[PDB]
């Protein structure tokens, strides 16, 4: 009975769930790599000061 | 049939995909906040200069 | 001779530069703070 | 006297005052392009 319409929407929401999972977790690392690079920046100012 | 294991799991799914939309409508807002007060901050500073 | 123009202008542009270290920093604190709130969420979210 | 210790340090206040300006606007845009990216991903979603 997996061909049935509740089957078949469950595994579109599925697909959803996961797609919103990915759009979080690819924005959590541009947070972390841009976090690291204003860090490092700090720092490059702090040695050349 | 609303009773069913299948349509029980597509409102559980649903609940599901409202609350990662959540997430990412209040980190939405908190990007606008920071970035809001970031550029009135070198607004102020060039202000004072 | 402190009051000389010389000792006034590094006066000014060290009140400056004080100033954008700050804002730098204070922003830092912010970014961090959101992102903090972001990851936690998401860590919310996996256990439930 | 432009080489006068006045003169001089003032030079070096100007560097570094100039580099802390960039920092501030390189990052304002390096934040900017990572929330373009992340509005436009919600409106793909939105009517996906």
Redesign the interface.
């Given at each position: 009975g997996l061909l049935?319409q509740?089957?078949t929407?469950?595994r579109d929401?599925?697909q959803?769930?996961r797609?919103?999972?990915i759009?979080?977790?690819?924005?959590?690392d541009?947070?972390?790599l841009?976090?690291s690079?204003?860090?490092k920046?700090?720092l490059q100012?702090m040695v050349?000061?």
């Open positions: 049935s509740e089957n929407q469950i929401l599925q959803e769930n797609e919103l999972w759009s979080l977790e690819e924005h959590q541009a947070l972390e841009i976090m690079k204003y860090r920046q700090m100012l050349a000061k």
